[PDB]
Write a protein that binds this ligand. Sequence first.
Ligand SMILES: O=C(O)[C@@](O)(COP(=O)(O)O)[C@H](O)[C@H](O)COP(=O)(O)O
Ligand SMILES: O=C(O)[C@@](O)(COP(=O)(O)O)[C@H](O)[C@H](O)COP(=O)(O)O
Ligand SMILES: [Mg+2]
Ligand SMILES: [Mg+2]
Lengths: 450, 450, 91
Amino acid sequence: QYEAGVRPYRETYYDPDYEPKDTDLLCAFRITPKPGVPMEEAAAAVAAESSTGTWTEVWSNQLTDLERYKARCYRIEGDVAYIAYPLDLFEEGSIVNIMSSIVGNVFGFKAVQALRLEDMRIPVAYLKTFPGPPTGIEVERDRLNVYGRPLLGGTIKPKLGLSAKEYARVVYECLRGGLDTTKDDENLNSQPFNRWRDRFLYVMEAVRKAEAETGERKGHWLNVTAGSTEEMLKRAEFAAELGSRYIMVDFLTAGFAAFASVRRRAEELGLMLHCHRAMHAVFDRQPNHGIHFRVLAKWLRMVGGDHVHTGTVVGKLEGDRAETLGIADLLREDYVPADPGRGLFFDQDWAGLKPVFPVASGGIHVWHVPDLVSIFGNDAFFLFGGGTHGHPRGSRAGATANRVAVEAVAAARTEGRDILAEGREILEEAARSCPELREAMELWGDVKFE
Amino acid sequence: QYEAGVRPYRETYYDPDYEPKDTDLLCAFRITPKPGVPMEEAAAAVAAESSTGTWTEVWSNQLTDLERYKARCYRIEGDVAYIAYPLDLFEEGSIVNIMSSIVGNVFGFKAVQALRLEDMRIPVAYLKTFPGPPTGIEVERDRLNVYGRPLLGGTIKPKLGLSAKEYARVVYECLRGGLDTTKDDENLNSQPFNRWRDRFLYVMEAVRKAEAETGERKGHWLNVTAGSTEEMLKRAEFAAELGSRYIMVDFLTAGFAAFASVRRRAEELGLMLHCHRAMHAVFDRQPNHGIHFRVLAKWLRMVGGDHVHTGTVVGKLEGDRAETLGIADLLREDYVPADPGRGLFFDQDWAGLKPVFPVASGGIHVWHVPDLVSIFGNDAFFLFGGGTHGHPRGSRAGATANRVAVEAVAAARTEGRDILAEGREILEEAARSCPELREAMELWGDVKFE
Amino acid sequence: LFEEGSIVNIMSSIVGNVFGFKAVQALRLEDMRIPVAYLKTFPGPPTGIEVERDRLNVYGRPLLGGTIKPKLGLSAKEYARVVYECLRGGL
Ligand SMILES: O=C(O)[C@@](O)(COP(=O)(O)O)[C@H](O)[C@H](O)COP(=O)(O)O
Ligand SMILES: O=C(O)[C@@](O)(COP(=O)(O)O)[C@H](O)[C@H](O)COP(=O)(O)O
Ligand SMILES: [Mg+2]
Ligand SMILES: [Mg+2]
């Protein structure tokens, strides 16, 4: 039955009658066809060229049962195509393989001028081949002995240029002042002005000093991001040898294959793994083309990060409130039902994988705390970089202002108060008893991001 | 001199009088500011948040000489911003670090609604920290014993679903019929229907069988892409054990850190490394946002791929001719001068690094050969997947057709003939002696992409 | 011309054979300009002045040292007795 020649993709790969199986992997693509290409043919091309098909009929199609393996577009709602992929198409436990199919080539076809992967339904049968986070929210709270509030953090600034000595000095001032954690900037790895061995040594010394002086458990997210998997693992081992509770990795710039290796070793070493999403905005910013972050967040939890940045909504970087509320649920809950209002196109069963800590960071200061607590609740990290070191009196006073603000708003929420309506009043009440908080509120009162 | 508060980014990070140094890393960004944000401020924000700055002044800025480490926008032409980065900002030999700075966070700022990295000037002093390709064009031509023509390849189809036995049957027919090489699809890793150990074994038996019957050297690009670096290295080692000349990696989905690890091991194993750019169109397609592929090509050559896909221009996937000509030079030449007509914003000295084979693949057939040879010349791989297996008489016949087409056009060019004006005649000439070629021309004569 | 990160290669070229030619009866290498692009292939000191001063907690003065004498002949026990006296005394 081999009939050589080109045929429309929709002949074989558009099936509006197909009923998805619980074992199918489902994708929701927002397709902008080339003018003149019908939506059905465009969605069939995506399905075909992300599973089994190519641009012309091949004699070798007779050597297998394509009906058993082909992906199928089974539903179209406007410019949104739903595609189902049989379980057997994917390599167990490999996000890399998911990407190679779902986003490998289908974004560059002339027939599809724009394409955005909006969401993906990971079947339970496939999730069971992934380990998920190595620590999880509950275990991490026990390790830090911190309950009932968000956790305080902050990126050391300037991003680059500080010696290891001056760098650990800022770390010490922050942790001493009330921050639970501090972190290397995503782009601080090992550079002539600040070599990783020096920084790890100096910083862990500052961590122990602040922990001893405050009586509270502290940590620093030592960035092991490096140019090769071997180098990253070497730095994770040094971090563990020094007694660090945490390491940090840029999981998108380093990449998913190496990220899996680091997550494996982090658990073996007893380290908690903070995951920075550097580069994500290259893929997930534009609504017409790319990969939505909620998909990257799912992949992140599947491989197993202990934290991942989720945006602030109200900070210097872009983030939608509704979509962020849905992403927090994808990271923390056992089961997330579909919700069009939040861009959740599918129900997501997490098959018992551990939850991930959301991390809100980027251009936030005290006045944002009511919003942040309203969005995330207690199970999140709030990071104040400039919002800490930019305090009129320096990092220690800035850390105190942010710690007090967060504890005051978290307490108000637990008391049943409306922290958005009474946000200002909650902060002013705490400011009367805290000069550092007052000075911070005066400094950045006029600083806002739409 | 520390004054707390928010300051304009351009006060420190915009310097239109700065003169770039030969040791500076230079970026060309096409910026779409948030409406109302001046171009100078947007460009300065990109510079500040990709180097040393943040959203508010910090007391710790006094602890280092930011003038020595800060990036600076030194030139703006309309919506293109040129930014210079001092050499000391970057970790030696780490593309991962380059990305963490240059594309880490600056694509997700509210103040910059779209941003595209158009080009990057890698300084010689930083290039000398990278190994480049392990094999290179010249050494590879010696290993295959092929000179004076493009090399023939082809992806096995259907992408997925073939058993290892049937998969190697298609491979043998292609190689027996005239293809120099065949390759696993980017998304074929190890799956229930086709496990990698089986495929590697079956395929290498087919490769040896075709090499003995043809008397020409053959290869198959065995995909080691996997969910972790360790697993990829394990599959590379098995490919070498079997005597394969090649392995293949999806260097963007696997990621740059694991890419470096596989490149290191490939050289140690004596393997040639084909690199598939799966996922590139997610962020190199749209002209308003992302990273142009020419930047990805430079990074690819620095880490050290032996080939990388470059597009076909005339095939099923999008690609501009002028931009592809420049990228081909970037992959193959020792020095590439700037050229506005091709989007080459900077001169690029390659500091003696070995060159990379361009690979043209995707929806091409015999009628495209005149264009392909005209674009790329002899130093390139042309891959015919569907264009081989879709032949009316099967893969071996298709391979003969494509092989005869490429050799006839390559011969015409070496004779001085204008292969674009006489492209059709050159192919009809060969068709009169090659029924396989004639059959292929009739089948796909009416199949064109814009 | 030079292998990255190899002082050994520098010497093999610059001072390998050219000091023993009949045509050049004496030759002295007075200085050498190491270009930045070649320097970036070398790691440099592992500690450095500043880090080392932090490890010893000594600032604002030269540091004191001293070779144990006699050069050779001291037992390990007596050798460490001299060391202790020196360090105890201010070195
Ligand atoms: O480099 C930066 O900008 C930060 O250190 C913030 O510093 P400030 O706290 O001084 O703003 C974080 O990496 C970003 O917030 C990441 O953005 P996201 O969390 O969206 O990935
Ligand atoms: O998956 C595919 O479509 C291919 O196997 C082509 O199959 P055909 O040869 O049957 O078209 C290649 O991976 C693409 O050409 C890659 O695109 P690029 O080279 O632009 O990365
Ligand atoms: Mg940062
Ligand atoms: Mg392919």
